[PDB]
Design a protein around this ligand. Structure first.
Ligand SMILES: NC(=O)C1=CN([C@@H]2O[C@H](COP(=O)(O)OP(=O)(O)OC[C@H]3O[C@@H](n4cnc5c(N)ncnc54)[C@H](OP(=O)(O)O)[C@@H]3O)[C@@H](O)[C@H]2O)C=CC1
Ligand SMILES: NC(=O)C1=CN([C@@H]2O[C@H](COP(=O)(O)OP(=O)(O)OC[C@H]3O[C@@H](n4cnc5c(N)ncnc54)[C@H](OP(=O)(O)O)[C@@H]3O)[C@@H](O)[C@H]2O)C=CC1
Ligand SMILES: NC(=O)C1=CN([C@@H]2O[C@H](COP(=O)(O)OP(=O)(O)OC[C@H]3O[C@@H](n4cnc5c(N)ncnc54)[C@H](OP(=O)(O)O)[C@@H]3O)[C@@H](O)[C@H]2O)C=CC1
Ligand SMILES: NC(=O)C1=CN([C@@H]2O[C@H](COP(=O)(O)OP(=O)(O)OC[C@H]3O[C@@H](n4cnc5c(N)ncnc54)[C@H](OP(=O)(O)O)[C@@H]3O)[C@@H](O)[C@H]2O)C=CC1
Ligand SMILES: O=C(O)[C@@H]1CCCO1
Ligand SMILES: O=C(O)[C@@H]1CCCO1
Ligand SMILES: O=C(O)[C@@H]1CCCO1
Ligand SMILES: O=C(O)[C@@H]1CCCO1
Lengths: 279, 278, 279, 277
């Protein structure tokens, strides 16, 4: 177990991801809010104000975030990453671990930029998701060419405080993006629709929202704690001739399964395009 | 808080195991204060209840005599036969909690009232995630259930997940939403994992990531004051990977399928309510 | 607020957009009709005659419009824009603000043409829509390379008199075109169909058109004045088991949402396509 | 013009709140002339209505005693219970205005006439945009409504939107069109915003632009003597962006989905009543 409670963390970008991670870390108690600095050009944004009330240091100056930070998260859109690297590359020091969270952007492209200024930049690529805000994120990371022995362990310890975290080979991360990165939006869509179905059949909206969300949470937790296949868990719900198997039929008749496959594929493929676009 | 109270299950299958495991993990009931009965003493769910410390028997009358709260955890078409069997054994102290999909309070009271008047009946709809103490449960109180009977039930079932009282005429819809709900999620998680596998993830990792993503999103919604659509908006950046995937969901009518599912399960439950009452 | 009550405005092109803007500006009382001039090569057109009855000055000669104008709107079709710039480029003076309304046409292409004649053309690109004719348009604009300090402020002040107006980065305007530029046609199609539905269920056509249009106007205004997500207002107004949620289901079963996404995307892509051909 | 008139709401939900707020914003009633009652009123609604100047009570009989015009703004299956509760308290002066989907004048008059003959009953269908004074309202007059009662109703509801008299047999169809209409619009605006976001717009800007486009287009049609198809033709330049988007709407049967929606809501409305009768 590595000690990191005293280190300073910075976010280039002060948007949804910066807020979600900063909220998760502080709510986990593993970092003090004043250890965190975030920067963006527009300092009148809603996420910036949300970060403000949390106690995070805010500035328009990306260089200040770099000078403040030990671990530096890149939390801008993919096409902005190369501009950021040109802007702050000269301010990267030997102490810095650069953790890119941008969809699609390769370690190789980041190291190429930063190596123009200083050899051996310590780079880690991450994909996470917004439920880090409730400490139930799904995070993977890959270590770059010059990442020190314990840089990967440090990032795993830090990110494990706000959800599941595991090291992966970098060539998996675009597919992770399509599954758990975009995944919450799939779930919010599903929850909205399930609530609509509950309302159609006579439930108050607030109850339908609560029951749907609790059903999804409980089922997901069951699967995480089970050694059983999701199909077996499915079999355990449905009684012969019963209500559940009738509902499963109408899902199958609409190709429900194929739509979720389509979604993971579409997000992964778009992620690969966001890299060739920023390239 | 629930010291001295005895609980019994008529039926020893998926739901009886789930509830018994959840109650005992919650510490609200000692396993030996729980008795379950089913005809086949060799079944797998009875094997695990035994290892859990739950008293087991093949005779439904033993469960009735042991219990204060009596859970009916048999299939809907088996309830009328159970009530015929144990009807003469219902005492004044008993609270009979039917878990069966579609079986109406009216049908249970009519059966039991032939043996002794004022049976205290509660109908509930729960789901299998009570086994990890994250269930979703509603209940409706019967004609002769005392107000404190509904309160006791809510406190007991709140130990294993969300629990709230509803009017009985909403239980069919709840069945279609949170009762069948886990099966929709297991289907979705299997398909999401297939999608991860297609794009190059190992199956075990894809399952873990998809399930963690669903759990985290559901917790976000429960801990948020905000609309699911608002949370959808907040997490879909312009031109990004997520909004591209949302479009292909929309093009297949994803939302309508989940509406169809809740409706289909509810309507089938109503057909079961009509069988119970006819 | 800038004093511009006395300035002169010109339209190259005397068609649907020139009429809608001139009608909105004069109805707002911010420009006098005799301070507006519009040109097109055919002087017996219906929009020309409509502009005529409004008191706008009309001419076949684009050079006359340029010489008349302080603010010069380009309201010709996208493929006509480069010919106009070649025609009038030598007549552009220091006083001129050139406001292109053409779908897809980039500030860069306009400045490149005009710069061959005189350096530092003051260029603004906008996207608007025909409801400026009832002073409820939706307008965005981006400022060009040589736009002076108050050129953007002037154009926002002018266009705010006929609807919503805000500055954007130019790279958003093709998307805006697919949303609020083409938006009114989506609405007219929807209103025709809703009225057909009213008629099928027994309403006189005139009443069905009136009710459908009032419903759409009121709902849009409700959303604009609420601090609410449209899904929340959908949720709030629906009732369990009720008529609305049954109708929402049949919309969903048809993939209604996906069609509107398809439309915005198709209009935006077509807008981008035409400009790639122009380049 | 309604110097002394008092208005009551039985119910305090989405519709009662929207009408009370629209009437308040219109300034058509004197101060403290609105009362609303419900049995378990959400505290956020209590707070909002109280700050607005609206009187509140859990007792429906008190609303009746307060009111000259009494709006019934409860769910359709709740209407007959309300009529049984308040029927003995209806007075000569009262105009009872049912807002409930599906519920016929006939059924209301039969309930009320058991207590006192000649209840003055009006049935309306409106929509939540009355809250911004842009509602769409129709009404039908009952058997004993005096002719001036329908005139008063029209003048009152005209202060918060369009309002016109119809035969009662049109109201279920109106419900499917302008009653449910706003929900169709909110769905469309959410989808249009998703489309703007997909093509690169910030969500907040996409929502603002889509809503403004819808508002402006609707106002154009209301202020035009032309067919919506003709207004469509004026945007659709040959080979242009708009006609390309219209094609993909047509390829998905966009128009038929909206016809399906109006039909489905109207048919369900007829079931919200054929079940009650
Ligand atoms: N949100 C999610 O669900 C997840 C997102 N990600 C990744 O995180 C990154 C950001 O996503 P998200 O936070 O959602 O996007 P946001 O739009 O919410 O945040 C973007 C931030 O970048 C800021 N920014 C823009 N230009 C600069 C600049 N030159 N220097 C510094 N900051 C700048 C913006 O400020 P302004 O608005 O003022 O330009 C805004 O604060 C993306 O690459 C995405 O792939 C990864 C996992 C999950
Ligand atoms: N599983 C779920 O997801 C949920 C199910 N429910 C309801 O719970 C009830 C049971 O569900 P589930 O547990 O899944 O079904 P199972 O089939 O898994 O368990 C059924 C049990 O009933 C027993 N049984 C059959 N006949 C008798 C009898 N005459 N006397 C005593 N026990 C008997 C069976 O024993 P044997 O195997 O020996 O026949 C078995 O132990 C159903 O009514 C269902 O609607 C409600 C919410 C969630
Ligand atoms: N209509 C809309 O909904 C919106 C349109 N726009 C943009 O506005 C521009 C015009 O659109 P719209 O007004 O609809 O198209 P119209 O066809 O209605 O008007 C086009 C005008 O250009 C005139 N014209 C053709 N050649 C010349 C020329 N060489 N010199 C001067 N005028 C000429 C035409 O005259 P003749 O008929 O004699 O050729 C006609 O008066 C387009 O670029 C479009 O993208 C932007 C937002 C909304
Ligand atoms: N929502 C809409 O878009 C439109 C709805 N309508 C019609 O308006 C009526 C109400 O709809 P809506 O306002 O949406 O429904 P809501 O559910 O939002 O409001 C229902 C109201 O009825 C109240 N209520 C329930 N029982 C009683 C009672 N015994 N005495 C008094 N009040 C009671 C509820 O009380 P509590 O506050 O205690 O829960 C709540 O205030 C319906 O008939 C609907 O058809 C018509 C046009 C538009
Ligand atoms: O299909 C069934 O019978 C049960 C009821 C609710 C969960 O699945
Ligand atoms: O939509 C996107 O591009 C990012 C990546 C996954 C979460 O949201
Ligand atoms: O959904 C319903 O039943 C009501 C009537 C129309 C507006 O919402
Ligand atoms: O269809 C077109 O190309 C024009 C321009 C954008 C609005 O409608």
């Amino acid at each position: 177990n590595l000690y990191f409670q005293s280190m300073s963390v910075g976010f280039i970008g002060a948007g949804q991801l910066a807020f979600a991670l900063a909220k998760g870390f502080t709510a986990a108690g593993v970092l003090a809010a004043h250890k965190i600095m975030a920067s963006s050009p527009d300092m009148d944004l809603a996420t910036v104000s949300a970060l403000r009330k949390m106690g995070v240091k805010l500035t328009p100056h990306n260089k200040e975030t770099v000078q403040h930070s030990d671990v530096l998260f890149l939390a801008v859109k993919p096409h902005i990453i190369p501009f950021i690297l040109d802007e702050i590359g000269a301010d990267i020091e030997d102490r810095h671990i650069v953790v890119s969270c941008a969809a699609g952007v390769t370690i190789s492209s980041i190291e190429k930029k930063l190596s123009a200024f200083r050899p051996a930049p310590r780079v880690i690529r991450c994909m996470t998701n917004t439920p880090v805000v409730v400490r139930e994120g799904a995070t993977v990371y890959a270590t770059g060419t010059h990442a020190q022995v314990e840089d990967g362990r440090l990032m795993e310890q830090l990110l494990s405080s706000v959800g599941f975290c595991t090291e992966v080979e970098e060539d998996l991360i675009d597919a992770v993006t399509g599954l758990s990165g975009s995944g919450p939006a799939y779930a919010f869509t599903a929850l909205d629709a399930l609530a609509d179905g509950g309302v159609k059949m006579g439930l108050p909206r607030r109850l339908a929202v609560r029951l749907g969300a609790q059903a999804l949470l409980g089922a997901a937790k069951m699967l995480l704690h089970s050694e059983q296949h999701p199909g077996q868990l499915k079999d355990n719900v449905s009684s012969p001739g019963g209500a559940t198997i009738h509902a499963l039929h109408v899902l199958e008749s609409g190709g429900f399964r194929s739509l979720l496959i389509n979604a993971v594929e579409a997000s992964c493929i778009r992620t690969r395009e966001l890299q060739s676009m920023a390239d």
